[PDB]
Amino acid sequence: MARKRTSKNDPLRMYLNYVRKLQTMGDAYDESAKYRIANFENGFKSLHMVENEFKQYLANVIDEAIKSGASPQDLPYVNEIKLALMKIFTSWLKYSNEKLGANEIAINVAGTATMTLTENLYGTRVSCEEAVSLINSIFAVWVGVEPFEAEEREGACLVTPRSPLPPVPISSPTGFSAPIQEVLQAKSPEEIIG
DNA sequence: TATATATATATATATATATATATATATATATATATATATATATATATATATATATATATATATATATATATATATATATATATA
């Protein structure tokens, strides 16, 4: 980037600077490819690992609830309610992916929990208290905290934290991963680097 | 005029050697068309759904990668203008 001098609130300057720099964006993207690809290479693994860990630990908690004698019509969690719980855990991935403190992660994930459990559990058979008990069970499996206390005090559901929350136990590495054919066909280590 | 040697034409039939046409049917060899169905081989179309493979569009959010715009201040890097 921004002009970094003053706000100068004026929409026509915004659109005109955008139209001016459209003749340079189309080449800066082509230049940006060369580090774009490697940063996605070592950034997508965190998403895919946290989504598989959510699937696995949700399956374990639901099966331990079924072994207590409940019916599989009592607890659906099929397509969109799992998508809600993946929304809160992926926002936990984001605020852990920055170098934030514990309670700042806790209250940002509590805000995302408020928005998500407000939106998509009206009209679908699942009260908010059961969903928040499920979220506390999943965090008891991951890091063993159970941080969130909830209420249905108004027409929406509201989530507030009780204790600070640790970041995700997954490190995003700064690697430069090379293929096995490049390892085998090379003649020297410096040919792999250089 | 008669005869031995060879090149072709006729006279009149019969025969061995091959090239094609008919007469009348039944075969064996192959190229294509129909009759009526059933089947194995592949090219595409529909009938109704469910699924594995990829190309893009949406439904509604939260993410990871990059291009630029703002929201509002403080910095670090450079281009010029001022204040004295």
PDB file of C-alpha atoms (C1' of nucleotides) in Angstrom:
ATOM      1  CA  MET A   1       2.205  -2.935  -0.976  1.00  0.00           C
ATOM      2  CA  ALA A   2       0.000   0.000   0.000  1.00  0.00           C
ATOM      3  CA  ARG A   3       0.923   3.676  -0.287  1.00  0.00           C
ATOM      4  CA  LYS A   4       1.880   3.667   3.434  1.00  0.00           C
ATOM      5  CA  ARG A   5       1.681   7.460   3.780  1.00  0.00           C
ATOM      6  CA  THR A   6      -1.930   8.384   4.511  1.00  0.00           C
ATOM      7  CA  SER A   7      -5.389   6.896   4.219  1.00  0.00           C
ATOM      8  CA  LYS A   8      -6.877   9.458   1.772  1.00  0.00           C
ATOM      9  CA  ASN A   9     -10.303   7.834   1.566  1.00  0.00           C
ATOM     10  CA  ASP A  10     -11.312   8.154  -2.088  1.00  0.00           C
ATOM     11  CA  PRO A  11     -12.674   5.250  -4.172  1.00  0.00           C
ATOM     12  CA  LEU A  12     -11.825   6.668  -7.578  1.00  0.00           C
ATOM     13  CA  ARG A  13      -8.110   6.756  -6.738  1.00  0.00           C
ATOM     14  CA  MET A  14      -8.422   3.094  -5.697  1.00  0.00           C
ATOM     15  CA  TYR A  15      -9.913   1.969  -8.995  1.00  0.00           C
ATOM     16  CA  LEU A  16      -7.547   4.153 -11.003  1.00  0.00           C
ATOM     17  CA  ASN A  17      -4.411   2.794  -9.325  1.00  0.00           C
ATOM     18  CA  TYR A  18      -5.742  -0.725  -9.923  1.00  0.00           C
ATOM     19  CA  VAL A  19      -6.243   0.034 -13.632  1.00  0.00           C
ATOM     20  CA  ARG A  20      -2.755   1.545 -13.749  1.00  0.00           C
ATOM     21  CA  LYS A  21      -1.050  -1.521 -12.271  1.00  0.00           C
ATOM     22  CA  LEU A  22      -2.935  -4.160 -14.270  1.00  0.00           C
ATOM     23  CA  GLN A  23      -0.191  -3.783 -16.886  1.00  0.00           C
ATOM     24  CA  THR A  24       2.404  -5.101 -14.388  1.00  0.00           C
ATOM     25  CA  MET A  25       0.432  -7.667 -12.342  1.00  0.00           C
ATOM     26  CA  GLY A  26       0.390 -10.010 -15.349  1.00  0.00           C
ATOM     27  CA  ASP A  27       4.194 -10.250 -15.328  1.00  0.00           C
ATOM     28  CA  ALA A  28       4.733 -10.169 -11.570  1.00  0.00           C
ATOM     29  CA  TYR A  29       2.625 -13.333 -11.316  1.00  0.00           C
ATOM     30  CA  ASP A  30       4.852 -15.131 -13.855  1.00  0.00           C
ATOM     31  CA  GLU A  31       7.885 -14.018 -11.881  1.00  0.00           C
ATOM     32  CA  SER A  32       6.324 -15.080  -8.557  1.00  0.00           C
ATOM     33  CA  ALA A  33       5.792 -18.702  -9.702  1.00  0.00           C
ATOM     34  CA  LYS A  34       9.348 -19.785  -8.842  1.00  0.00           C
ATOM     35  CA  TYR A  35       8.891 -19.431  -5.072  1.00  0.00           C
ATOM     36  CA  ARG A  36       5.088 -19.811  -5.121  1.00  0.00           C
ATOM     37  CA  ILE A  37       5.426 -23.499  -6.005  1.00  0.00           C
ATOM     38  CA  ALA A  38       7.923 -24.417  -3.268  1.00  0.00           C
ATOM     39  CA  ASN A  39       6.062 -22.510  -0.558  1.00  0.00           C
ATOM     40  CA  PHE A  40       2.852 -24.349  -1.433  1.00  0.00           C
ATOM     41  CA  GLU A  41       4.862 -27.605  -1.576  1.00  0.00           C
ATOM     42  CA  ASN A  42       5.761 -27.263   2.078  1.00  0.00           C
ATOM     43  CA  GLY A  43       2.616 -25.437   3.190  1.00  0.00           C
ATOM     44  CA  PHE A  44      -0.198 -27.739   2.071  1.00  0.00           C
ATOM     45  CA  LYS A  45       0.995 -30.617   4.275  1.00  0.00           C
ATOM     46  CA  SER A  46      -0.162 -28.843   7.439  1.00  0.00           C
ATOM     47  CA  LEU A  47      -3.733 -28.539   6.130  1.00  0.00           C
ATOM     48  CA  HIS A  48      -3.871 -32.125   4.959  1.00  0.00           C
ATOM     49  CA  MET A  49      -2.444 -33.462   8.221  1.00  0.00           C
ATOM     50  CA  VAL A  50      -4.802 -31.444  10.417  1.00  0.00           C
ATOM     51  CA  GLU A  51      -7.815 -32.508   8.338  1.00  0.00           C
ATOM     52  CA  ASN A  52      -6.855 -36.189   8.543  1.00  0.00           C
ATOM     53  CA  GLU A  53      -6.262 -35.858  12.284  1.00  0.00           C
ATOM     54  CA  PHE A  54      -9.706 -34.305  12.699  1.00  0.00           C
ATOM     55  CA  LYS A  55     -11.312 -37.150  10.714  1.00  0.00           C
ATOM     56  CA  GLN A  56      -9.510 -39.785  12.782  1.00  0.00           C
ATOM     57  CA  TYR A  57     -10.141 -38.302  16.214  1.00  0.00           C
ATOM     58  CA  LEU A  58     -13.778 -37.483  15.437  1.00  0.00           C
ATOM     59  CA  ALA A  59     -14.243 -41.103  14.346  1.00  0.00           C
ATOM     60  CA  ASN A  60     -12.674 -42.328  17.602  1.00  0.00           C
ATOM     61  CA  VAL A  61     -14.835 -40.080  19.816  1.00  0.00           C
ATOM     62  CA  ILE A  62     -18.029 -40.982  17.927  1.00  0.00           C
ATOM     63  CA  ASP A  63     -17.253 -44.706  18.135  1.00  0.00           C
ATOM     64  CA  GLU A  64     -16.591 -44.447  21.873  1.00  0.00           C
ATOM     65  CA  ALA A  65     -19.968 -42.722  22.177  1.00  0.00           C
ATOM     66  CA  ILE A  66     -21.653 -45.500  20.163  1.00  0.00           C
ATOM     67  CA  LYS A  67     -20.065 -48.163  22.400  1.00  0.00           C
ATOM     68  CA  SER A  68     -21.927 -46.546  25.318  1.00  0.00           C
ATOM     69  CA  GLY A  69     -25.182 -47.713  23.712  1.00  0.00           C
ATOM     70  CA  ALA A  70     -26.400 -44.737  21.685  1.00  0.00           C
ATOM     71  CA  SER A  71     -28.074 -45.032  18.308  1.00  0.00           C
ATOM     72  CA  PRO A  72     -26.530 -43.822  15.018  1.00  0.00           C
ATOM     73  CA  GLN A  73     -29.612 -41.679  14.445  1.00  0.00           C
ATOM     74  CA  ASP A  74     -28.896 -39.742  17.656  1.00  0.00           C
ATOM     75  CA  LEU A  75     -25.627 -38.239  16.378  1.00  0.00           C
ATOM     76  CA  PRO A  76     -25.576 -37.629  12.602  1.00  0.00           C
ATOM     77  CA  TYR A  77     -22.425 -35.499  12.005  1.00  0.00           C
ATOM     78  CA  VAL A  78     -22.523 -36.357   8.327  1.00  0.00           C
ATOM     79  CA  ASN A  79     -21.474 -33.686   5.874  1.00  0.00           C
ATOM     80  CA  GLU A  80     -22.054 -30.096   6.966  1.00  0.00           C
ATOM     81  CA  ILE A  81     -21.685 -30.441  10.721  1.00  0.00           C
ATOM     82  CA  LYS A  82     -18.277 -32.013  10.120  1.00  0.00           C
ATOM     83  CA  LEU A  83     -17.630 -29.043   7.847  1.00  0.00           C
ATOM     84  CA  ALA A  84     -18.459 -26.707  10.753  1.00  0.00           C
ATOM     85  CA  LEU A  85     -16.057 -28.505  13.066  1.00  0.00           C
ATOM     86  CA  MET A  86     -13.402 -28.426  10.371  1.00  0.00           C
ATOM     87  CA  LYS A  87     -13.944 -24.655  10.096  1.00  0.00           C
ATOM     88  CA  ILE A  88     -13.100 -24.141  13.772  1.00  0.00           C
ATOM     89  CA  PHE A  89     -10.101 -26.473  13.619  1.00  0.00           C
ATOM     90  CA  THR A  90      -8.718 -24.893  10.443  1.00  0.00           C
ATOM     91  CA  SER A  91      -8.961 -21.445  12.020  1.00  0.00           C
ATOM     92  CA  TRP A  92      -7.027 -22.965  14.915  1.00  0.00           C
ATOM     93  CA  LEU A  93      -4.431 -24.006  12.338  1.00  0.00           C
ATOM     94  CA  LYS A  94      -4.234 -20.404  11.102  1.00  0.00           C
ATOM     95  CA  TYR A  95      -3.840 -18.718  14.470  1.00  0.00           C
ATOM     96  CA  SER A  96      -1.290 -21.351  15.452  1.00  0.00           C
ATOM     97  CA  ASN A  97       0.535 -20.872  12.149  1.00  0.00           C
ATOM     98  CA  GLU A  98       1.369 -17.358  13.246  1.00  0.00           C
ATOM     99  CA  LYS A  99       3.582 -17.019  16.311  1.00  0.00           C
ATOM    100  CA  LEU A 100       0.720 -15.969  18.571  1.00  0.00           C
ATOM    101  CA  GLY A 101       0.427 -16.520  22.299  1.00  0.00           C
ATOM    102  CA  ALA A 102      -1.795 -19.091  23.936  1.00  0.00           C
ATOM    103  CA  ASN A 103      -4.836 -17.054  24.970  1.00  0.00           C
ATOM    104  CA  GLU A 104      -4.840 -15.035  21.745  1.00  0.00           C
ATOM    105  CA  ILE A 105      -5.238 -18.326  19.890  1.00  0.00           C
ATOM    106  CA  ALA A 106      -7.909 -19.268  22.447  1.00  0.00           C
ATOM    107  CA  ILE A 107     -10.045 -16.184  21.930  1.00  0.00           C
ATOM    108  CA  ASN A 108      -9.685 -16.088  18.137  1.00  0.00           C
ATOM    109  CA  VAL A 109     -10.762 -19.739  17.927  1.00  0.00           C
ATOM    110  CA  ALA A 110     -13.595 -18.892  20.339  1.00  0.00           C
ATOM    111  CA  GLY A 111     -14.734 -16.121  17.999  1.00  0.00           C
ATOM    112  CA  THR A 112     -14.660 -18.438  14.985  1.00  0.00           C
ATOM    113  CA  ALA A 113     -16.574 -20.981  17.092  1.00  0.00           C
ATOM    114  CA  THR A 114     -19.188 -18.316  17.863  1.00  0.00           C
ATOM    115  CA  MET A 115     -19.693 -17.469  14.179  1.00  0.00           C
ATOM    116  CA  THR A 116     -19.697 -21.077  12.970  1.00  0.00           C
ATOM    117  CA  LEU A 117     -21.934 -22.550  15.680  1.00  0.00           C
ATOM    118  CA  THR A 118     -24.236 -19.565  15.240  1.00  0.00           C
ATOM    119  CA  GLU A 119     -24.686 -20.105  11.512  1.00  0.00           C
ATOM    120  CA  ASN A 120     -25.119 -23.801  10.752  1.00  0.00           C
ATOM    121  CA  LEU A 121     -26.850 -25.471  13.657  1.00  0.00           C
ATOM    122  CA  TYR A 122     -30.235 -23.759  13.537  1.00  0.00           C
ATOM    123  CA  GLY A 123     -32.805 -26.157  12.150  1.00  0.00           C
ATOM    124  CA  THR A 124     -30.743 -29.337  12.199  1.00  0.00           C
ATOM    125  CA  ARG A 125     -31.525 -31.513  15.245  1.00  0.00           C
ATOM    126  CA  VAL A 126     -28.225 -30.835  17.090  1.00  0.00           C
ATOM    127  CA  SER A 127     -28.199 -28.501  20.087  1.00  0.00           C
ATOM    128  CA  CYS A 128     -25.192 -26.278  20.676  1.00  0.00           C
ATOM    129  CA  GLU A 129     -24.273 -27.804  24.050  1.00  0.00           C
ATOM    130  CA  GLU A 130     -23.681 -31.228  22.496  1.00  0.00           C
ATOM    131  CA  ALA A 131     -21.506 -29.700  19.766  1.00  0.00           C
ATOM    132  CA  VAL A 132     -19.417 -27.801  22.315  1.00  0.00           C
ATOM    133  CA  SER A 133     -19.037 -30.961  24.399  1.00  0.00           C
ATOM    134  CA  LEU A 134     -17.809 -32.677  21.226  1.00  0.00           C
ATOM    135  CA  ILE A 135     -15.292 -29.888  20.524  1.00  0.00           C
ATOM    136  CA  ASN A 136     -14.043 -30.083  24.116  1.00  0.00           C
ATOM    137  CA  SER A 137     -13.661 -33.847  23.721  1.00  0.00           C
ATOM    138  CA  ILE A 138     -11.596 -33.418  20.541  1.00  0.00           C
ATOM    139  CA  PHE A 139      -9.329 -30.877  22.248  1.00  0.00           C
ATOM    140  CA  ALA A 140      -9.040 -33.298  25.164  1.00  0.00           C
ATOM    141  CA  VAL A 141      -7.771 -35.875  22.666  1.00  0.00           C
ATOM    142  CA  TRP A 142      -5.316 -33.491  20.934  1.00  0.00           C
ATOM    143  CA  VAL A 143      -3.729 -31.412  23.696  1.00  0.00           C
ATOM    144  CA  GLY A 144      -5.837 -32.200  26.756  1.00  0.00           C
ATOM    145  CA  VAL A 145      -7.245 -28.790  27.696  1.00  0.00           C
ATOM    146  CA  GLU A 146     -11.060 -28.612  27.169  1.00  0.00           C
ATOM    147  CA  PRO A 147     -11.057 -24.796  26.928  1.00  0.00           C
ATOM    148  CA  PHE A 148     -14.517 -23.663  25.793  1.00  0.00           C
ATOM    149  CA  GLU A 149     -17.615 -22.908  27.859  1.00  0.00           C
ATOM    150  CA  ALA A 150     -20.759 -22.144  25.891  1.00  0.00           C
ATOM    151  CA  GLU A 151     -24.297 -20.855  26.243  1.00  0.00           C
ATOM    152  CA  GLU A 152     -27.475 -20.664  24.183  1.00  0.00           C
ATOM    153  CA  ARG A 153     -28.329 -17.488  26.072  1.00  0.00           C
ATOM    154  CA  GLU A 154     -29.804 -15.682  23.072  1.00  0.00           C
ATOM    155  CA  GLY A 155     -31.125 -16.939  19.726  1.00  0.00           C
ATOM    156  CA  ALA A 156     -27.542 -17.687  18.645  1.00  0.00           C
ATOM    157  CA  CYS A 157     -24.950 -19.821  20.401  1.00  0.00           C
ATOM    158  CA  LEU A 158     -22.052 -18.058  22.114  1.00  0.00           C
ATOM    159  CA  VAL A 159     -18.656 -19.607  22.883  1.00  0.00           C
ATOM    160  CA  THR A 160     -16.221 -18.122  25.405  1.00  0.00           C
ATOM    161  CA  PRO A 161     -12.888 -19.561  26.574  1.00  0.00           C
ATOM    162  CA  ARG A 162     -11.965 -20.694  30.065  1.00  0.00           C
ATOM    163  CA  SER A 163      -8.258 -21.471  29.678  1.00  0.00           C
ATOM    164  CA  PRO A 164      -5.435 -20.715  27.226  1.00  0.00           C
ATOM    165  CA  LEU A 165      -5.021 -22.958  24.206  1.00  0.00           C
ATOM    166  CA  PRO A 166      -1.720 -24.396  22.917  1.00  0.00           C
ATOM    167  CA  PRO A 167      -0.826 -24.184  19.217  1.00  0.00           C
ATOM    168  CA  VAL A 168      -1.059 -27.104  16.790  1.00  0.00           C
ATOM    169  CA  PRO A 169       1.519 -29.937  17.278  1.00  0.00           C
ATOM    170  CA  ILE A 170       2.580 -29.726  13.609  1.00  0.00           C
ATOM    171  CA  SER A 171       5.632 -27.830  12.312  1.00  0.00           C
ATOM    172  CA  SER A 172       5.588 -26.379   8.796  1.00  0.00           C
ATOM    173  CA  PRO A 173       9.095 -27.024   7.423  1.00  0.00           C
ATOM    174  CA  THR A 174      11.230 -24.833   5.169  1.00  0.00           C
ATOM    175  CA  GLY A 175      12.360 -27.692   2.954  1.00  0.00           C
ATOM    176  CA  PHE A 176      13.363 -27.847  -0.690  1.00  0.00           C
ATOM    177  CA  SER A 177      12.285 -31.428  -1.460  1.00  0.00           C
ATOM    178  CA  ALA A 178      13.972 -33.000  -4.503  1.00  0.00           C
ATOM    179  CA  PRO A 179      12.826 -36.040  -6.514  1.00  0.00           C
ATOM    180  CA  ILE A 180      14.416 -39.452  -6.152  1.00  0.00           C
ATOM    181  CA  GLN A 181      15.315 -39.443  -9.855  1.00  0.00           C
ATOM    182  CA  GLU A 182      17.332 -36.262  -9.311  1.00  0.00           C
ATOM    183  CA  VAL A 183      19.110 -38.004  -6.432  1.00  0.00           C
ATOM    184  CA  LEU A 184      19.931 -41.150  -8.396  1.00  0.00           C
ATOM    185  CA  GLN A 185      20.840 -39.609 -11.763  1.00  0.00           C
ATOM    186  CA  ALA A 186      23.198 -37.039 -10.218  1.00  0.00           C
ATOM    187  CA  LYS A 187      26.956 -37.454  -9.908  1.00  0.00           C
ATOM    188  CA  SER A 188      27.695 -35.213  -6.915  1.00  0.00           C
ATOM    189  CA  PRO A 189      25.881 -33.596  -3.976  1.00  0.00           C
ATOM    190  CA  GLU A 190      26.587 -30.118  -5.361  1.00  0.00           C
ATOM    191  CA  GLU A 191      24.791 -31.082  -8.561  1.00  0.00           C
ATOM    192  CA  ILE A 192      21.697 -31.681  -6.421  1.00  0.00           C
ATOM    193  CA  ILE A 193      22.107 -28.323  -4.681  1.00  0.00           C
ATOM    194  CA  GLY A 194      23.516 -26.242  -7.537  1.00  0.00           C
TER     195      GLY A 194
ATOM    196  C1'  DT B   1       5.733 -80.148-114.623  1.00  0.00           C
ATOM    197  C1'  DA B   2       6.879 -83.505-110.704  1.00  0.00           C
ATOM    198  C1'  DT B   3       9.785 -83.407-105.840  1.00  0.00           C
ATOM    199  C1'  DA B   4      12.657 -82.299-100.756  1.00  0.00           C
ATOM    200  C1'  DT B   5      13.003 -77.294 -97.377  1.00  0.00           C
ATOM    201  C1'  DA B   6      10.319 -73.640 -94.511  1.00  0.00           C
ATOM    202  C1'  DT B   7       6.220 -68.792 -94.170  1.00  0.00           C
ATOM    203  C1'  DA B   8       0.658 -67.929 -94.252  1.00  0.00           C
ATOM    204  C1'  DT B   9      -4.697 -68.707 -97.028  1.00  0.00           C
ATOM    205  C1'  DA B  10      -8.429 -72.025 -98.268  1.00  0.00           C
ATOM    206  C1'  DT B  11     -11.349 -77.295 -99.144  1.00  0.00           C
ATOM    207  C1'  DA B  12     -13.814 -80.620 -95.286  1.00  0.00           C
ATOM    208  C1'  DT B  13     -13.989 -83.167 -90.749  1.00  0.00           C
ATOM    209  C1'  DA B  14     -12.137 -85.630 -86.506  1.00  0.00           C
ATOM    210  C1'  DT B  15      -8.078 -84.899 -82.580  1.00  0.00           C
ATOM    211  C1'  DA B  16      -3.967 -83.090 -78.763  1.00  0.00           C
ATOM    212  C1'  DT B  17      -2.276 -77.573 -76.848  1.00  0.00           C
ATOM    213  C1'  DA B  18      -3.793 -73.090 -74.477  1.00  0.00           C
ATOM    214  C1'  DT B  19      -7.165 -67.787 -74.550  1.00  0.00           C
ATOM    215  C1'  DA B  20     -12.495 -66.067 -73.607  1.00  0.00           C
ATOM    216  C1'  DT B  21     -18.388 -66.714 -74.803  1.00  0.00           C
ATOM    217  C1'  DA B  22     -22.636 -69.498 -74.271  1.00  0.00           C
ATOM    218  C1'  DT B  23     -26.127 -74.383 -73.036  1.00  0.00           C
ATOM    219  C1'  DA B  24     -27.899 -76.381 -67.988  1.00  0.00           C
ATOM    220  C1'  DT B  25     -27.151 -77.673 -63.197  1.00  0.00           C
ATOM    221  C1'  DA B  26     -24.716 -79.446 -58.727  1.00  0.00           C
ATOM    222  C1'  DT B  27     -19.444 -78.561 -56.293  1.00  0.00           C
ATOM    223  C1'  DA B  28     -14.509 -76.627 -54.202  1.00  0.00           C
ATOM    224  C1'  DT B  29     -11.817 -71.116 -54.034  1.00  0.00           C
ATOM    225  C1'  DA B  30     -12.269 -65.948 -52.667  1.00  0.00           C
ATOM    226  C1'  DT B  31     -14.903 -60.254 -53.174  1.00  0.00           C
ATOM    227  C1'  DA B  32     -19.627 -57.684 -51.588  1.00  0.00           C
ATOM    228  C1'  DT B  33     -25.844 -57.674 -51.169  1.00  0.00           C
ATOM    229  C1'  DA B  34     -30.046 -59.289 -49.157  1.00  0.00           C
ATOM    230  C1'  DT B  35     -33.598 -63.497 -45.586  1.00  0.00           C
ATOM    231  C1'  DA B  36     -33.972 -63.960 -40.355  1.00  0.00           C
ATOM    232  C1'  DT B  37     -32.129 -64.288 -35.708  1.00  0.00           C
ATOM    233  C1'  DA B  38     -28.825 -65.468 -31.799  1.00  0.00           C
ATOM    234  C1'  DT B  39     -23.252 -64.701 -30.677  1.00  0.00           C
ATOM    235  C1'  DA B  40     -17.581 -63.164 -30.170  1.00  0.00           C
ATOM    236  C1'  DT B  41     -14.491 -58.295 -32.108  1.00  0.00           C
ATOM    237  C1'  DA B  42     -14.053 -52.979 -31.925  1.00  0.00           C
ATOM    238  C1'  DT B  43     -16.400 -47.081 -33.342  1.00  0.00           C
ATOM    239  C1'  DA B  44     -20.061 -43.665 -31.497  1.00  0.00           C
ATOM    240  C1'  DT B  45     -25.974 -42.669 -29.696  1.00  0.00           C
ATOM    241  C1'  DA B  46     -29.612 -43.013 -26.424  1.00  0.00           C
ATOM    242  C1'  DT B  47     -32.629 -45.777 -21.418  1.00  0.00           C
ATOM    243  C1'  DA B  48     -31.746 -45.034 -15.988  1.00  0.00           C
ATOM    244  C1'  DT B  49     -28.836 -44.584 -12.022  1.00  0.00           C
ATOM    245  C1'  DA B  50     -24.662 -45.374  -8.669  1.00  0.00           C
ATOM    246  C1'  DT B  51     -19.135 -45.238  -9.009  1.00  0.00           C
ATOM    247  C1'  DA B  52     -13.192 -44.683 -10.220  1.00  0.00           C
ATOM    248  C1'  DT B  53     -10.378 -40.536 -14.064  1.00  0.00           C
ATOM    249  C1'  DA B  54      -9.387 -35.674 -15.303  1.00  0.00           C
ATOM    250  C1'  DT B  55     -11.453 -30.055 -17.586  1.00  0.00           C
ATOM    251  C1'  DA B  56     -14.148 -25.610 -15.828  1.00  0.00           C
ATOM    252  C1'  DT B  57     -19.259 -23.364 -13.255  1.00  0.00           C
ATOM    253  C1'  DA B  58     -21.947 -22.601  -9.004  1.00  0.00           C
ATOM    254  C1'  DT B  59     -23.977 -23.459  -3.169  1.00  0.00           C
ATOM    255  C1'  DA B  60     -21.240 -21.217   1.891  1.00  0.00           C
ATOM    256  C1'  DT B  61     -17.633 -20.743   4.742  1.00  0.00           C
ATOM    257  C1'  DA B  62     -12.958 -21.152   7.249  1.00  0.00           C
ATOM    258  C1'  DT B  63      -7.613 -22.443   5.413  1.00  0.00           C
ATOM    259  C1'  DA B  64      -2.354 -23.021   2.720  1.00  0.00           C
ATOM    260  C1'  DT B  65       0.209 -20.221  -2.424  1.00  0.00           C
ATOM    261  C1'  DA B  66       0.922 -15.873  -5.278  1.00  0.00           C
ATOM    262  C1'  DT B  67      -1.014 -10.621  -8.268  1.00  0.00           C
ATOM    263  C1'  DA B  68      -2.773  -5.766  -7.113  1.00  0.00           C
ATOM    264  C1'  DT B  69      -6.875  -2.037  -3.957  1.00  0.00           C
ATOM    265  C1'  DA B  70      -8.221   0.093   0.390  1.00  0.00           C
ATOM    266  C1'  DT B  71      -8.830   0.477   6.355  1.00  0.00           C
ATOM    267  C1'  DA B  72      -4.681   3.357   9.914  1.00  0.00           C
ATOM    268  C1'  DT B  73      -0.364   4.163  11.915  1.00  0.00           C
ATOM    269  C1'  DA B  74       4.612   3.487  13.241  1.00  0.00           C
ATOM    270  C1'  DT B  75       9.389   1.026  10.600  1.00  0.00           C
ATOM    271  C1'  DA B  76      13.511  -0.741   6.995  1.00  0.00           C
ATOM    272  C1'  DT B  77      14.810   0.065   1.223  1.00  0.00           C
ATOM    273  C1'  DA B  78      15.424   3.725  -2.902  1.00  0.00           C
ATOM    274  C1'  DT B  79      13.267   8.330  -6.618  1.00  0.00           C
ATOM    275  C1'  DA B  80      12.308  13.842  -6.299  1.00  0.00           C
ATOM    276  C1'  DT B  81       9.513  18.410  -3.566  1.00  0.00           C
ATOM    277  C1'  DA B  82       9.476  21.470   0.531  1.00  0.00           C
ATOM    278  C1'  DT B  83      10.479  23.669   5.999  1.00  0.00           C
ATOM    279  C1'  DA B  84      15.647  26.683   7.960  1.00  0.00           C
TER     280       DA B  84
END
